[PDB]
Design an enzyme around this catalytic site. Structure first.
Site, PDB file in Angstrom:
ATOM      1  N   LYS A  41      36.538  43.067  42.494  1.00 19.44           N
ATOM      2  CA  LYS A  41      36.166  42.208  41.410  1.00 19.44           C
ATOM      3  C   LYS A  41      37.074  42.027  40.178  1.00 19.44           C
ATOM      4  CE  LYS A  41      33.412  40.426  42.559  1.00 19.44           C
ATOM      5  NZ  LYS A  41      33.793  39.342  43.477  1.00 19.44           N
ATOM      6  N   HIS A 101      41.568  45.655  49.537  1.00 18.98           N
ATOM      7  CA  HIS A 101      40.982  46.603  48.662  1.00 18.98           C
ATOM      8  C   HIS A 101      41.269  48.036  49.031  1.00 18.98           C
ATOM      9  CE1 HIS A 101      39.229  43.023  46.745  1.00 18.98           C
ATOM     10  NE2 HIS A 101      38.618  42.866  47.619  1.00 18.98           N
ATOM     11  N   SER A 131      30.475  42.772  37.226  1.00 19.89           N
ATOM     12  CA  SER A 131      30.771  42.002  38.160  1.00 19.89           C
ATOM     13  C   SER A 131      30.472  42.451  39.543  1.00 19.89           C
ATOM     14  CB  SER A 131      32.346  41.500  38.314  1.00 19.89           C
ATOM     15  OG  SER A 131      32.534  40.675  39.110  1.00 19.89           O
ATOM     16  N   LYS A 223      37.591  27.286  35.340  1.00 19.67           N
ATOM     17  CA  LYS A 223      37.022  26.044  35.577  1.00 19.67           C
ATOM     18  C   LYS A 223      37.403  25.304  36.628  1.00 19.67           C
ATOM     19  CE  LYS A 223      40.214  24.228  32.224  1.00 19.67           C
ATOM     20  NZ  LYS A 223      41.401  23.945  32.976  1.00 19.67           N
TER      21      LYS A 223
HETATM   22  N1  LIG Z   1      40.524  31.689  37.607  1.00 19.71           N
HETATM   23  C1  LIG Z   1      39.958  32.763  37.305  1.00 19.71           C
HETATM   24  N2  LIG Z   1      40.150  33.048  35.787  1.00 19.71           N
HETATM   25  C2  LIG Z   1      39.529  34.253  35.243  1.00 19.71           C
HETATM   26  N3  LIG Z   1      38.441  34.877  36.153  1.00 19.71           N
HETATM   27  C3  LIG Z   1      38.386  34.294  37.458  1.00 19.71           C
HETATM   28  C4  LIG Z   1      39.005  33.581  37.910  1.00 19.71           C
HETATM   29  N4  LIG Z   1      38.813  33.443  39.310  1.00 19.71           N
HETATM   30  C5  LIG Z   1      37.941  34.285  39.644  1.00 19.71           C
HETATM   31  N5  LIG Z   1      37.687  35.049  38.528  1.00 19.71           N
HETATM   32  C6  LIG Z   1      36.841  36.245  38.174  1.00 19.71           C
HETATM   33  O1  LIG Z   1      37.120  37.336  39.232  1.00 19.71           O
HETATM   34  C7  LIG Z   1      36.025  38.088  39.624  1.00 19.71           C
HETATM   35  C8  LIG Z   1      36.169  38.100  41.135  1.00 19.71           C
HETATM   36  O2  LIG Z   1      37.295  38.758  41.323  1.00 19.71           O
HETATM   37  P1  LIG Z   1      37.421  39.070  43.161  1.00 19.71           P
HETATM   38  O3  LIG Z   1      38.254  37.734  43.393  1.00 19.71           O
HETATM   39  O4  LIG Z   1      38.574  40.410  42.522  1.00 19.71           O
HETATM   40  O5  LIG Z   1      36.221  39.317  43.674  1.00 19.71           O
HETATM   41  C9  LIG Z   1      34.799  37.291  38.891  1.00 19.71           C
HETATM   42  O6  LIG Z   1      34.259  37.938  37.700  1.00 19.71           O
HETATM   43  P2  LIG Z   1      33.054  37.829  37.012  1.00 19.71           P
HETATM   44  O7  LIG Z   1      32.026  38.378  38.042  1.00 19.71           O
HETATM   45  O8  LIG Z   1      33.471  38.458  35.764  1.00 19.71           O
HETATM   46  O9  LIG Z   1      32.936  36.222  36.453  1.00 19.71           O
HETATM   47  C10 LIG Z   1      35.366  35.910  39.027  1.00 19.71           C
HETATM   48  O10 LIG Z   1      34.558  34.948  38.152  1.00 19.71           O
HETATM   49  N1  LIG Z   2      30.466  38.502  53.984  1.00 24.78           N
HETATM   50  C1  LIG Z   2      31.584  39.035  53.169  1.00 24.78           C
HETATM   51  C2  LIG Z   2      32.344  39.121  52.404  1.00 24.78           C
HETATM   52  C3  LIG Z   2      32.558  40.419  51.996  1.00 24.78           C
HETATM   53  C4  LIG Z   2      33.557  40.570  50.745  1.00 24.78           C
HETATM   54  C5  LIG Z   2      33.845  41.715  50.274  1.00 24.78           C
HETATM   55  C6  LIG Z   2      34.766  41.994  49.545  1.00 24.78           C
HETATM   56  C7  LIG Z   2      35.702  41.091  49.133  1.00 24.78           C
HETATM   57  O1  LIG Z   2      36.749  41.217  48.325  1.00 24.78           O
HETATM   58  C8  LIG Z   2      35.574  39.908  49.680  1.00 24.78           C
HETATM   59  C9  LIG Z   2      34.482  39.353  50.570  1.00 24.78           C
HETATM   60  O2  LIG Z   2      34.328  38.280  51.069  1.00 24.78           O
HETATM   61  C10 LIG Z   2      33.290  38.145  52.152  1.00 24.78           C
HETATM   62  O3  LIG Z   2      33.201  36.902  52.466  1.00 24.78           O
END
Ligand SMILES: Nc1ncnc2c1ncn2[C@@H]1O[C@H](COP(=O)(O)O)[C@@H](OP(=O)(O)O)[C@H]1O
Ligand SMILES: N#Cc1cc2ccc(O)cc2oc1=O
Ligand SMILES: N#Cc1cc2ccc(O)cc2oc1=O
Length: 288
Positions: A41, A101, A131, A223
């Site tokens: 996240k 990760h 998140s 967006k």
């Molecule tokens: N282009 C972008 N700009 C800013 N935040 C982004 C983004 N793309 C994804 N995110 C945010 O990055 C997080 C997901 O991270 P990961 O890709 O590491 O799982 C989410 O945060 P939030 O849940 O705070 O909105 C997602 O909305």
């Molecule tokens: N099911 C499932 C999933 C789990 C998951 C966990 C962590 C992650 O960064 C990305 C991920 O994408 C997935 O599709």
């Protein structure tokens, strides 16, 4: 269905990802690989899209060839009836972008030995925790998150999938002293995405015209990424991620943790954080 985490060498993982470590032992890194490494996240999907666009020389039509999880193999990924990261990797042409990760204790040794370039992205812990709580709700391979209060308590002791945020961001920061690592912050990318895209370009040794960099800034915006079916995870099966519970592309802001943490939670979290982060030279911004 929401199975318990399985511990491997001290790290709690999703049970399917723990099983994936077996086939992953036969993985061989190439010297021109690039590894995107994050605690969950923290901006994984965002930097994956920026990297893939750079690798396609800014060509948006090429970035649409498949979802981001197929263009950038998630190394330890596995889920029932979905191909594994390792199976997806076999078909991925070089130079490959790879996502993980995994804590350093579990990372395939071949990626350090081959001196593979690492783009690491860190994000402030409080926005990561919020998140991650929402993600636990929509991404059904995780255990029940419980209440926000109870999940925050587990987060602070690292009893969530992939373990401790505190250990992750510190060990990869230390790794960057002896291994080629570009260490980015989510909050810096929110403040000035063009500046961070320029740093990633320099790290991977490419240059692109200014009009192309501006084009990538626009196409890697929150967006644009929320509505792109190739980056917003809406093509994954409903049994694995339910976007009606919480969208994957949720809010995309720095500082919105403040509407979720109570004052008591914030006080407890801040005292715990000062102890955990005492010896570390990292410093995070909680807001812009
Ligand atoms: N282009 C972008 N700009 C800013 N935040 C982004 C983004 N793309 C994804 N995110 C945010 O990055 C997080 C997901 O991270 P990961 O890709 O590491 O799982 C989410 O945060 P939030 O849940 O705070 O909105 C997602 O909305
Ligand atoms: N099911 C499932 C999933 C789990 C998951 C966990 C962590 C992650 O960064 C990305 C991920 O994408 C997935 O599709
Ligand atoms: N359907 C489907 C799929 C979902 C999916 C989710 C996460 C991931 O890392 C890889 C994936 O590959 C897939 O083919």
């Amino acid at each position: 269905s929401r199975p318990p985490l399985e511990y491997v060498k001290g790290v709690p993982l999703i049970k399917y990802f723990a099983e994936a470590l077996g086939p992953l032992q036969s993985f061989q890194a190439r010297p021109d690989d690039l590894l995107i490494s994050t605690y969950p996240k923290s901006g994984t999907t965002w930097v994956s899209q920026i990297l893939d666009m750079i690798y396609q020389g800014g060509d948006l039509e090429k970035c649409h060839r498949a979802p981001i999880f197929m263009r950038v193999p998630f190394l330890e990924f596995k889920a029932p009836g979905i191909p594994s990261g390792m199976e997806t990797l076999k078909d991925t042409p070089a130079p490959r972008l790879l996502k993980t990760h995994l804590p350093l204790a579990l990372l395939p040794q071949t990626l350090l030995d081959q001196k593979v370039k690492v783009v690491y992205v860190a994000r402030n812990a409080k926005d990561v925790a919020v998140s991650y709580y929402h993600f636990y709700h929509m991404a059904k391979v995780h255990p029940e998150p419980g209440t926000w209060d109870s999940f925050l308590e587990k987060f602070m002791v690292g009893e969530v999938s992939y373990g401790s945020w505190y250990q992750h961001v510190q060990e990869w920061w230390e790794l960057s002293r002896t291994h080629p690592v570009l260490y980015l912050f989510y909050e810096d990318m929110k403040e000035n995405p063009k500046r961070e895209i320029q740093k990633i370009l320099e790290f991977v040794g490419h240059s692109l015209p200014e009009e192309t960099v501006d084009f990538m800034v626009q196409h890697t915006s929150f967006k644009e990424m929320k509505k792109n079916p190739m980056t917003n995870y809406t093509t994954v099966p409903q049994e694995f991620m339910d976007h009606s519970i919480s969208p994957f592309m949720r809010k995309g802001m720095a500082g919105d943790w403040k509407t979720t943490f109570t004052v008591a939670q914030n006080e407890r979290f801040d005292a715990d954080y000062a102890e955990k982060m005492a010896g570390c030279s990292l410093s995070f911004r909680s807001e812009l």
